[PDB]
Enzyme design. Structure first.
Site, PDB file in Angstrom:
ATOM      1  N   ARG A   1      41.013  40.213  41.562  1.00 28.33           N
ATOM      2  CA  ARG A   1      40.226  40.767  42.659  1.00 28.33           C
ATOM      3  C   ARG A   1      40.075  39.767  43.799  1.00 28.33           C
ATOM      4  NH1 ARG A   1      41.519  43.010  38.859  1.00 28.33           N
ATOM      5  NH2 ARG A   1      40.524  44.783  37.807  1.00 28.33           N
ATOM      6  N   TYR A   2      39.838  38.497  43.471  1.00 22.46           N
ATOM      7  CA  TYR A   2      39.610  37.478  44.489  1.00 22.46           C
ATOM      8  C   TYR A   2      40.899  36.804  44.947  1.00 22.46           C
ATOM      9  CZ  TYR A   2      37.691  33.355  46.821  1.00 22.46           C
ATOM     10  OH  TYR A   2      37.390  32.372  47.735  1.00 22.46           O
ATOM     11  N   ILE A   3      41.813  36.514  44.018  1.00 25.95           N
ATOM     12  CA  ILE A   3      43.034  35.808  44.386  1.00 25.95           C
ATOM     13  C   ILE A   3      43.984  36.754  45.120  1.00 25.95           C
ATOM     14  CG2 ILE A   3      44.375  36.259  42.300  1.00 25.95           C
ATOM     15  CD1 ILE A   3      44.060  32.898  44.195  1.00 25.95           C
TER      16      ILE A   3
END
EC number: 5.6.2.2
Lengths: 477, 477
Positions: free
Chosen positions: A84-86
């Protein structure tokens, strides 16, 4: 398989622009366009696996640019971050050079539900079925194969392509009798160990440092494709080896391998008198598991569907060249075929301006009666939106739907397009593709195979992309 | 004020298509386009107030089509539903007839922050400042005014417009001396009561039914502009009237008024001997508050900014006609001015085809040298995208930026546009606006004022829209 699905989605997603895209957003984009519903986590796991870059990984060079920490050699890439973040980025430089974009139009595509699907197989400049180890995009079954060094395959393809290579006829001689005079050895990059071969089996060995003055044993190089934690539990499995071990501390780290091992000198005297004194390796490197036997699982995707087994790496490579060889012939012939269609199109428009308002009149423009009249005028009834903009069409269907075309490529142009200034741009263009046609005509006539010169240039482009990637901090700019 | 902001947003929102839109979505759409940040609830309250339709409401006919229960006469529209769930629909039939769309381009607009804003005032076919009562879009200050009946204003405008009206010169005679021969009386629709006038004040009275055989008093008609609950608390305020009241039960309902009041016959004998025996009304209708005095707050928006006071409804109406009178003159003159610009445009293109490939050559098309050459050819250097597509431009700025135009309306057309078939559509069109120009030329020359015939037709269209709305179940289809 799923590898081809991600690659085609990646180039399509970043065709307009190559920017930073979230892995979850990229994963949804791939799934949306190809209706891949095997699981977003499974698809994201395959995306991370395809884009991972660690020493000893299945993919020596990732398909996509690695952003952030996608894994490590200690856990074998199982410590990937949150998708989700990377973010993930497409490797525009390598994929364009490795996979010819203009050759992607001629790949054998399959169609389901009236929509385009993934090609059966991709044939890039170099055989990707050799340089990459085994991986498991799915669960349960694990693929394991060993990659050859990046020097022998280049010598094989260069001799098969370049005319000036001394081992040109000899290489072609070796094909008929399958003698395989050229050498083929496993990979060596990011491996500070040893490669030694007995019979038909290969073995890898690590490096250890023993210092007498400080009485400290230093571990230098880990084996080729074993996790660091797997090596630790391997030495902690045997019950008898516990009596031989006093203290073991893991000092392994990313991009820095310096592990200190404590072993009293009292123990070194009696190690060599119950381990049979192996002649291949000393008991110091025999007590610690540093040797890995190689049993290559050589397989290739069947063009008709299925899997195939080969006795050696040469058989995989010797069958890979003709598939790439034929595609070089096909891309040149289709480009030559479509180029002359653009030649007659531009000439007819220029000739239309010659017979336009300035000189001649053909303003009747009747549908059926003037069709024969325009036929006598020599104007080709070719359809636009195909010659100007080629698409996924082969050679044999190209001419059938172009000669039997339709009008509105003429007598429907801008009134400024028949000006002298507009004509000058057209007459200065018609020579450009005519000159480019001469370059193609000079090609596709060489005795070995069509398009030999471009193959050498494409090989050089691949080499430049690899060097630039390893030179900078994986930024490609 | 805020009324004009909602109306312009409503027509703009439903210009493409008139469908069902949520009030909250419609409220956000209005606020987004005009940057109205006085409060979404306040804007939604004004939207509901503008679109409400109940007997005795401030707006006799709502601007927007009323969907669902927007209010009731008992609480004076304070029982509106949730704007999130309820929807609003624009009254396409009435607004198009009431507000001329082609006349909206000529309204005096103000500009702030380099963007279009709301017009200072709207001038529709009929004066909306008379037919609508007072309302409070904001809080604190309440506007209260009484609307005239929908028969006297029509007689006033028809006499001022139609040539055959017998009271045509007499109406113009009354303007100079302000004698106001024509009558003006308050509204009567949805009011089954009485209107009676003393001095300079008007009073409204309800209807009650008294039956001797059943000894039951029935309430028939409520007053004009009082809430039902307000009437109840009004009769429960006085302490002495409690001794006169035994039982009062509210039976009021929407679209059905039948209230039974119980009063013993013993009480009726002594009511009339301490209430001074009012001569205007009997004590039966004097004990119950059925009379409302009228004190009209007549005001109109200042064109230069501010508020104005008038002594009578005639002064408001007598000043409203010249503003509508001038706009009829302006819309015809601008339409005539732009129509001849389209005449020379189409003729020049047709003449260009006459001097096109078939007959003459002007293919040089130089920028400066041929500008005089094309000037001698008579081709007008008029710019397109303005004559073909008019915008918010007045008459005096129309010709200045059209005569000093630019090319590419010629010599940049489709090559099929110079065909005989294409020419036939152009030559059959140039007569159409030429014939339409004759109709406009026949107008704007009448002695009273320009555009008298269209005003009568617009009045008839307004009447048809009102009748159709009240005939069906508020569906307009």
């Amino acid at each position: 398989r799923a590898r081809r699905k991600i690659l085609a989605g990646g180039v399509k997603c970043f065709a307009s622009n190559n920017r930073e895209r979230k892995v979850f957003q990229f994963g949804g984009y791939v799934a949306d366009h190809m209706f891949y519903h095997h699981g977003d986590m499974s698809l994201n796991t395959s995306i991370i696996k395809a884009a991972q870059y660690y020493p000893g990984s299945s993919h020596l060079y990732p398909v996509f640019i690695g952003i952030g920490s996608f894994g490590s050699r200690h856990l074998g890439g199982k410590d990937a971050g949150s998708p989700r973040y990377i973010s993930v980025q497409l490797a525009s430089e390598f994929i364009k050079t490795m996979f010819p974009a203009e050759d992607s139009w001629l790949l054998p595509y399959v169609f389901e539900d009236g929509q385009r699907a993934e090609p059966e197989y991709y044939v890039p400049v170099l055989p990707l079925a050799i340089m990459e180890y085994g991986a498991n995009p799915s669960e349960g079954w694990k693929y394991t194969t060993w990659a050859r060094q990046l020097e022998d395959i280049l010598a094989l393809v260069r001799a098969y392509v370049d005319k000036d290579n001394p081992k040109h006829e000899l290489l072609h001689y070796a094909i008929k009798h399958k003698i395989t005079i050229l050498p083929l050895r496993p990979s060596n990059y990011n491996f500070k160990g040893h490669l030694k071969r007995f019979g038909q089996y290969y073995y890898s060995y690590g490096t250890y440092d023993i210092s007498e003055q400080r009485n400290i044993i230093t571990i230098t190089e880990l084996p080729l494709r074993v996790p660091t934690v797997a090596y630790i539990e391997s030495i902690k499995k045997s019950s008898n080896r516990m009596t031989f071990i006093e203290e073991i501390i893991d000092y392994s780290s990313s991009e820095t391998i310096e592990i200190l091992v404590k072993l009293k000198p009292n123990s070194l005297n009696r190690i060599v008198e119950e381990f049979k004194e192996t002649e291949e390796q000393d008991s110091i490197e025999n007590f610690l598991r540093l040797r890995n036997c190689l049993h290559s699982h050589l397989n290739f995707v069947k063009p008709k569907g299925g899997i195939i087994e080969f006795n050696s790496y040469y058989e995989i490579l010797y069958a890979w060249l003709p598939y790439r060889r034929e595609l070089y012939q096909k891309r040149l012939m289709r480009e030559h075929a479509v180029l002359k269609l653009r030649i007659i199109m531009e000439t007819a428009i220029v000739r239309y301006i010659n017979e336009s308002a300035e000189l001649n009149l053909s303003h009747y423009e009747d549908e059926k009666e003037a069709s024969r009249i325009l036929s006598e005028h020599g104007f080709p009834p070719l359809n636009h939106t195909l010659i100007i903009s080629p698409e996924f069409a082969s050679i044999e269907e190209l001419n059938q739907k172009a000669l039997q075309g339709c009008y509105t490529y003429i007598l429907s142009l801008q009134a400024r397009e028949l000006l002298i200034a507009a004509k000058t741009r057209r007459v200065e263009k018609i020579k450009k593709m005519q000159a480019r046609l001469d370059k193609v005509e000079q090609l596709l006539q060489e005795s070995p195979f069509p398009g030999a010169s471009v193959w050498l240039e494409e090989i050089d482009a691949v080499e430049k992309a690899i060097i630039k990637g390893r030179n900078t901090q994986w930024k490609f700019h």
